[PDB]
Structures are given as C-alpha cells and as structure tokens.
Design a protein around this ligand. Structure first.
Ligand SMILES: Nc1ncnc2c1ncn2[C@@H]1O[C@H](COP(=O)(O)OP(=O)(O)OP(O)(O)=S)[C@@H](O)[C@H]1O
Ligand SMILES: Nc1ncnc2c1ncn2[C@@H]1O[C@H](COP(=O)(O)OP(=O)(O)OP(O)(O)=S)[C@@H](O)[C@H]1O
Ligand SMILES: Nc1ncnc2c1ncn2[C@@H]1O[C@H](COP(=O)(O)OP(=O)(O)OP(O)(O)=S)[C@@H](O)[C@H]1O
Ligand SMILES: [Mg+2]
Ligand SMILES: [Mg+2]
Ligand SMILES: [Mg+2]
Lengths: 746, 135
C-alpha cells in the first residue's frame, strides 16, 4: 500500500521532459514543482524528468508525453514507480547520434539548426540511452543520447560539449518509432475517442481477467461519417496504442480478385487473427463488400456477403477478437449486418466545429515554421464546411506557395541540398489568405450539429419570453427532482408565431446557447427538396440525429412554406407533415430532445400540430415597443464605431411600427453612406496629392472614422415599413384565437 | 451462506448448483460417512479440498438451455409444447393412432426476441435429436 505506484493517462502539456502530477499526491509523495524525478518501467528501463503541477490531473493517474512513454516501454494504463532524486549532477561530454531513417533527406549541418535552440534556457534532464525528438524545418528528427561522461544521467549545462559527428545508427527491432500514429495526431473528436477507448481498452488490456469474469464484450464497432474525417486514422491509432495485433482488410482489394481468391482471403484473415489473439480486424470500406440486397447482382457478390455473415456469427467460438469497420453512411450497408452479435455498436464521427478545426490546424503545422503574424484562430473561424482532409490540403498548399516565392528568389543554386534556405523559410499570413480562396470545401450539404454562438445580448427586448423559455427548456434539465416530486410531466414542444422579422430564429438559437445544448436547424424548403420516394428515410434520419446528440434543440423554421405548397396536387407537403407528426408521437422525453417551430402565417397551419403532446405551447412574438426599439438599435451597433452625437431614442420615436429587420436595414444603409463618403475622400486626396507632387504635409489619416447624425438622418428618409396596419390587426386577432383552430374553426 | 439455516437433505452422488459472483458453480456430494443420505447439520465437516473431477458422458449439464431461461412468452411456449411434446414423447402410440401431427412450425417476430433460444430449449427439454441448418 504505497503512494508512489502510478498509472499513465494522456498528456496535455507539449514538452518532451515534463511530467505532471496533482498537488495532494505531490504533498503526500514529498515532491515540489522544481524537482527532478526518476521513473522506473518495464524491462528495467528508467527515465528522468521534471515534474510540475496540475488540477485537472487526478491522484491515481499521471500524465506524460509520448516520448517519455516510449522510452519506458510503457503503454496507456500500465504501472510506473516514481521517486525523487536530487542526486543529479552536471556533465562534461555528451555524445548524440541521429537515427538513420529521419536523416535521409537533409545533409550539411545539424548542430546550429536543431540542437542549438533546444537546450537554451532548458537544462533538460537526460540519461544514457534515451531517444528524444526535435521539430522544425518541415521535418521532425530523432536523436539518442548515447554516452555521458558523468555516467549515466545528468543535466545538459553549457559545460557539456555535445558530439554531433558520426554515422546515424540503425534501430533496434523493438524500438517503438515516432512516425507511427498515436492519440496526439487526432483532433476535434474528443468524445468519440473516449467512447472507443471505453469499449476497446479493457477487453484487450486484460484478456484473462475479462474471460474470467463472464460478461460479453462488444464485437462489432461500426465507425461512420462523411468522407475524409479520419476513420482509418482512428482505427490505426487505437491499434498502435493498445499494442494489439492488427490485420487490415481493404474493400476494393478483396473485390478486385477473382472469385475463389476473394472467399479465401476473407477466411485467411479471420483464421490468422485466431492464431494471434488479442487482435483487431479492420474492414475498411465495408459498403464495397456488402452493399444493399437490391444493389447486388449475381452469385459472387451475394456469396461474399453470406461469407462475411458466417464469419461474424462464428466469432463467438473464438477468443478475443474485435472487428471494426468503416463506411460513409449506414444506410447503404446490407441490414442483416447490423443485428445483435454482428455490427451492433455504432460510433458517429462528424465534421468538426471551430475548436476542432483549430486543433487540426495546429497538428498539421507542427514541422513547419510560421511567420509571426499568422494567427490560426482566424483561419479556424474562416474555414467552414472543411473536414480534416481539406485542412491538411490547405496547409500543404500554403507551404508550397511559400516555397514557390523563395524559388522566385533562389532558383540557381537551390538545386543542391541546403539547410540554410530551409532556415530562412517562413510562411506568412498572405499565403493562408491566398489558399483559403482557392480551396473547394466538401461538406456544405451536411447538417451541422453544434452549439450556436448567439447569446442573449444579441437580442433586444422580449423579456418575459426569455423567462418562459428558461422555465420550459432549462428547468427540466437541471432540476429533475422537482418534477418528480410535484407529479407533473414537462412538455415537449413550443410554437412561435407572429409578424415577419421580429426575432424568432434568434430566440431559438439563444436558448440553445444558454443551456449549452446542441442545435439542429431545418428549413421548409429543405424538406420540400427531399423527393417523392426519398423523404421518408430523410425525416427519420433527422430524428435519429437528434437522438444521438442529446440534449438537443431541434428547430423547424419556416413552416409557412410547407403550408403554402399544399393546395397550390401538393402531395409532398402532406406526406412531409404526416411524417413529422408520426415522429413527434414516437419521441420519448427521457433523452431531453426539445422541439420548436416557427410561422409567419398562423392561419394556414395544420391544426393537428397543435394537439396536446405535440407543439402545444403557443408563444406570440409581437412588434417591438419604444424601449425595445432602443435596445434593438443598441444591439445591432456594437461592432460599428458610432459617434457620440447620435441620439438613438430619437430614432426610436421616429420609427413606429417597424420590425427588427427594418431597424437593421436602417443601420446597413447608414453604413453604406459612410463607406461612399470615405472612398470619395480618398479618391480626392489621391488626385490632389498626385496632381501636386512634393506636398509639404504627408498626413495619411482617416478623414471620417465614425458615423454621425447626417448619415442616420439621411438613411431615415428611405425607410419603409414591412408590416402594414391591416396585418397588425390580423395578428392581434390570431394572438387570442389560434388555439380554437382544432374544431370546425375558421 | 448456502447451508446456513437451511438443513438441506442431501444424498451421495447428487449434483447441486450455487449462484453468486458473476458465475454459477456446480458441485457433487461425493461421500457421506452416515451413508448414503443425510441432512447437513453444523456437525458435518465439509471437505472442499481436492481436484475438480471430470464429468460422466451422460451427466446432463446445467449450462444447457431449458424453459427457465425464457421469460415473457408464457402463452407461445405453451402452444409449442402442445404441438410438439406428444408426437416426440410417444412416437409408437401416436403412429398407432392414425392422426396426422403437425410438421411445419414457423416462428416469427422482430429481431432479437429469442427464437433460436426457444427452439433450442424445446430440443433440450424433450430430449429429441436436433440438427441445426443455418441460412
Ligand atoms: N481529425 C483529424 N485530425 C487530424 N488529421 C486528420 C483528421 N481527419 C483527417 N485527417 C487527415 O486526413 C487524412 C485522410 O483521412 P482518412 O483517414 O483517410 O479519412 P477517411 O475516413 O479515410 O476518409 P475516406 O472515406 O476513407 S477517403 C488523414 O491521413 C489525416 O492526414
Ligand atoms: N429582437 C431583435 N433583436 C435584434 N436583432 C433583431 C431582432 N429581431 C430581428 N433582428 C435582426 O433581424 C434579423 C432577422 O431576424 P430573425 O430572428 O431571423 O427574424 P425572423 O423571425 O426569422 O423573421 P425572418 O422572416 O427570418 S426576417 C436578425 O438576423 C437580426 O439581425
Ligand atoms: N425472452 C427472452 N428471455 C431471455 N433472454 C432472451 C429473450 N429473448 C432474447 N434473449 C436474449 O437475447 C439473445 C439473442 O436472442 P436470439 O435467440 O438471438 O433472438 P433471435 O430470434 O435469434 O433474433 P435474431 O433475428 O436471430 S438476431 C439470447 O441469446 C438471450 O440472451
Ligand atoms: Mg479510409
Ligand atoms: Mg429567420
Ligand atoms: Mg436467430
């Protein structure tokens, strides 16, 4: 019962000689955050590192980098003893040698480019026989600390002369390489990688214990997503990091053979993974082998599908084999493969969000050298609809434009192998600014599931509606116990209705931002574009995406288009509304999926939507008042530089009966007047400066930097109301008599 | 915990079964000194040391499937017993009657509701020969 045996978890820090610990474990273990610890591992191999602190780190777990993890012959979830050692002295001679595979391109220097900035103000604790890694110069490079004269371990001081001359040596056959793929090469998919580790790590770490329990493990894991999102990468990383045997079956490579060779290749893969248990068999591109029953023709294709089903069912009589697979959508797989005892667990890898895209861009720009203006958060906010492969291509294209301009400088003697041109080489912001425009993203039709970025501050007015939406959406998530006590059940749906342009889409986004839930937006034209024989699996697919990503807000915008397409034979409108109604009835509230609709025409809505148990909360969103108009105009003008002279309350008194869209239109029109005036002034000053050279005052400056009362008072003369007064009386009537539409009605 | 406040009447040569610990376990009462049958009192010292022995080839195992592994389908299992139990219990008598039995029984339902299980249980519990063809 010792407090020094610890177990490895994933690393957050980026350094090669830093381990992390939580503070109570250090205080029990008598360690401070400047110490120099010694770490023992399997096959009697040990390491030396600098410890620091963390709060996200637990006590039963230590977080260390992959380079330390591979110098200890340790994988994820293994045992390591830590002990303090202030017995570390400085050095005199330290002999390093590169490793033969990483040094086949460059020749010339290795000391000043690589080793010189690495040990400067670092004092990295090294030991004899350790491999370390340096990034820089569009390449990563390995070295091994071969010999220390104060043997065996020391701290690299400026006293130590570092021998970097000799032959790059060969590897030992059990040295784990650093060009392999691990968990740090994957970004933007934290949750899914956690699920796959939970499913897979225990039945492959502990086969004997888990056989001795008597529980069944999973055996079929189907990864799916759009093309190019890193599924082959995830399977390869789980295989390398658990250390299991790994056999790869490729889809076209099996279907390209002749007949009896295809059957025997499948059978040999499953037998060979019997022999070397534990294993992982990865079937890449499954829908080339086993597509739909109606899309196969012949004897050979159906015979291969039946072969694969026999082997998947016969895995039960085997020991410790996981079968993974990958496909671009689940609906094209033969549905007999997704039963029980076959591919029964599904993991969905989607397109990344903004945090994900920044993390991809940081992965691919490791070995490159960036210029000092390049801010990758702006690139990550610009690139929308990019999967990971597109971001890798964008980084590669920017690097090639930089090397092309340096061949515009240096072309004559650049043909030799120089390290200096690589030293000077840098990628500016305009290269990324170029390659952003000449890039063709590939996931724009895909439905986006993310948290929105519209807070409550973008919305002006509407103060009781916000309270009512909190009490509908947020309260049965945070406080389920009150609803258990008082004996009621929460409701499921809301319908917003009202005049055009008053802020319904913004409210539906802001409550999803408030509750930190996902958000799926569907518009009426998107449902009507879905075809005659195609709308069915599509509406079911949207309600499935809502169940997988719960707690969710599923928002049906623009219902008046679906209503107007009925009656001019409008059969597709009736088919879509009936199928939405059936899916709402089937939905059980124990996943916290919450449904919202919105309409500008509350007179032609289908009354069966308003039934209790369906969208039966009716919130009327009206034209704003004078205080509300002041709040709207303040909300739209937060980014614009506005002069002090502007009176907003005067604009609110002058604009009566406007909606929110018209107030935004007035702001847009005034800003265009400002840009026109500025460009006239720049043409006039350029003309005058060029027509009178040698001017005594070279004073470049903003002539008008802000928006004054002239611009708003001119933009006010072109204002037009969007909602006429007869319409206002009709919306006031429906505000009270909408709920009576279900009987005979009107 | 098994024999505590139980006083279970045992006999020499019987197999019994204990559940617990994410596993079921078998034992056989091999030898009683008041031969052959007795009641397990706190007087009895219970020898639980030795080698776990092999089975006899006609010992019916308890990892097989019977009618107690099926739940939630009382009515249908009653129908299948009525159709099947008499023509397989008494073949000679039923041939001597002159009535035809059924010969094709189609079980159907959604995926995952235990159809393979029901057929396997009827096969084990009647003791008929059983051949499995897989599609
Ligand atoms: N999440 C990611 N993080 C880092 N790199 C990624 C990521 N996703 C994709 N990539 C890069 O994109 C390349 C192609 O990804 P793939 O693994 O081929 O994706 P995929 O699932 O194979 O798509 P298909 O349908 O097989 S073409 C990878 O080799 C990586 O370089
Ligand atoms: N209450 C409001 N506060 C701030 N901006 C608003 C408000 N209402 C409307 N806007 C602005 O007007 C635009 C239209 O708002 P939406 O919420 O999309 O209105 P809508 O109810 O969906 O009606 P339409 O048909 O879509 S214009 C928004 O993008 C805002 O720029
Ligand atoms: N009524 C039940 N009582 C107890 N366990 C059941 C029951 N139904 C299913 N199971 C369990 O579910 C497992 C799978 O059932 P199966 O016998 O495979 O059903 P099934 O009819 O084979 O479905 P398919 O279409 O063949 S995949 C069984 O091995 C049992 O563990
Ligand atoms: Mg692939
Ligand atoms: Mg809108
Ligand atoms: Mg079956």
């Amino acid at each position: 019962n010792r407090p020094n045996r610890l177990i490895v978890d994933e690393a957050i820090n980026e350094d090669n000689s830093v381990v992390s610990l939580s503070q109570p474990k250090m205080d029990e273990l008598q360690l401070f955050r400047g110490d120099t610890v010694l770490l023992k591992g399997k096959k009697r191999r040990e390491a030396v590192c600098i410890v620091l602190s963390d709060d996200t780190c637990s006590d039963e777990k230590i977080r260390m980098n992959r380079v330390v993890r591979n110098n200890l012959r340790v994988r994820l979830g293994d045992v390591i003893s830590i002990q303090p050692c202030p017995d570390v002295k400085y050095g005199k001679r330290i002999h390093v040698l590169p490793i033969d595979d990483t040094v086949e391109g460059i020749t010339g220097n290795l000391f000043e480019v690589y080793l010189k900035p690495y040990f400067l103000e670092a004092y990295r604790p090294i030991r004899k026989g350790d491999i370390f890694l340096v990034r820089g110069g569009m390449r990563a490079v390995e070295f091994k600390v071969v010999e220390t004269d104060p043997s065996p371990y020391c701290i690299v001081a400026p006293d130590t002369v570092i021998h970097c001359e000799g032959e790059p040596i060969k590897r030992e056959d059990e040295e784990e390489s650093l060009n392999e793929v691990g968990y740090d090469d994957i970004g933007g998919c934290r949750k899914q990688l956690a699920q796959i580790k939970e499913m897979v790590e225990l039945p492959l770490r502990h086969p004997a214990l888990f056989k001795a329990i008597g529980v069944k493990p999973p055996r079929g894991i189907l990864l799916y997503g759009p093309p190019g999102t890193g599924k082959t990468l995830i399977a390869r990383a789980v295989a390398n990091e658990t250390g299991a045997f790994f056999f790869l079956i490729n889809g076209p490579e099996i279907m390209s053979k002749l007949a009896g060779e295809s059957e025997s290749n499948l059978r040999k893969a499953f037998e060979e993974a019997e022999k070397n248990a534990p294993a992982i068999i990865f079937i890449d591109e499954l829908d080339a082998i086993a597509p739909k029953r109606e899309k196969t023709h012949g004897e050979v294709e159906r015979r291969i599908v039946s072969q694969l089903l026999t082997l998947m069912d016969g895995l039960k009589q085997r020991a410790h084999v996981i079968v993974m697979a990958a496909t671009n959508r689940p609906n094209s797989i033969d549905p007999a493969l997704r039963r029980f005892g076959r591919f029964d667990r599904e993991v969905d890898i989607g397109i990344p969000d903004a945090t994900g895209r920044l993390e991809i861009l940081q992965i691919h720009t490791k070995n490159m050298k960036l210029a000092d203006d390049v801010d990758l958060e702006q690139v990550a906010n610009e690139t929308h609809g990019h999967v990971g492969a597109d971001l890798a291509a964008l980084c590669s294209e920017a690097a090639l434009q930089a090397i092309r301009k340096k061949m515009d400088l240096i072309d004559l003697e650049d043909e030799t192998i120089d390290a200096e041109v690589m030293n000077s080489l840098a990628v500016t912001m305009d290269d990324f600014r170029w390659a952003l425009s000449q890039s063709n993203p590939s996931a724009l039709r895909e439905t986006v599931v993310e948290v929105p970025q519209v807070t409550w501050e973008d919305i002006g007015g509407l103060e009781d509606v916000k309270r009512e939406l909190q009490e509908l959406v947020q309260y049965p998530v945070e406080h389920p116990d009150k609803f258990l006590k008082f004996g009621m059940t929460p409701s499921k749906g809301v319908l917003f209705y009202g005049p055009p342009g008053c802020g319904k889409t913004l409210l539906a986004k802001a409550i999803a931002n408030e509750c930190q839930a996902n958000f799926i937006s569907i518009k009426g034209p998107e449902l009507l574009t879905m075809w005659f024989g195609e709308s069915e699996a599509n509406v079911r697919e949207i309600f499935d995406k809502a169940r997988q990503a719960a707690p969710c807000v599923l928002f049906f915008d623009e219902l008046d288009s679906i209503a107007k397409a009925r009656g001019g034979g409008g059969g597709a409108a009736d088919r879509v509304i009936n199928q939405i109604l059936t899916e709402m009835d089937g939905m059980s509230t124990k996943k916290n999926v919450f449904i919202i609709g919105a309409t500008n025409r509350p007179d032609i809505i289908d009354p069966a939507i308003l039934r209790p148990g369906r969208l039966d909360q009716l919130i009327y969103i009206p034209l704003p008042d004078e205080k509300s108009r002041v709040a709207i105009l303040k909300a739209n003008l937060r980014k614009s530089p506005v002069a002090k002279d502007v009176d907003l309350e005067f604009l609110a008194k002058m604009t009566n009966g406007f909606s929110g869209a018209d107030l935004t239109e007035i702001c847009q029109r005034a800003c265009k007047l400002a840009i026109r005036e500025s460009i006239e002034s720049e043409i006039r000053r350029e003309r005058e400066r060029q027509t009178n050279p040698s001017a005594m005052e070279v004073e470049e400056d903003d002539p008008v930097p802000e928006i004054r009362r002239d611009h708003f008072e001119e933009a006010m003369r072109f204002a037009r109301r969007s909602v006429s007064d007869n319409d206002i009386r009709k919306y006031e009537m429906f505000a009270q008599t909408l709920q009576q539409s279900r009987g005979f009605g009107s």
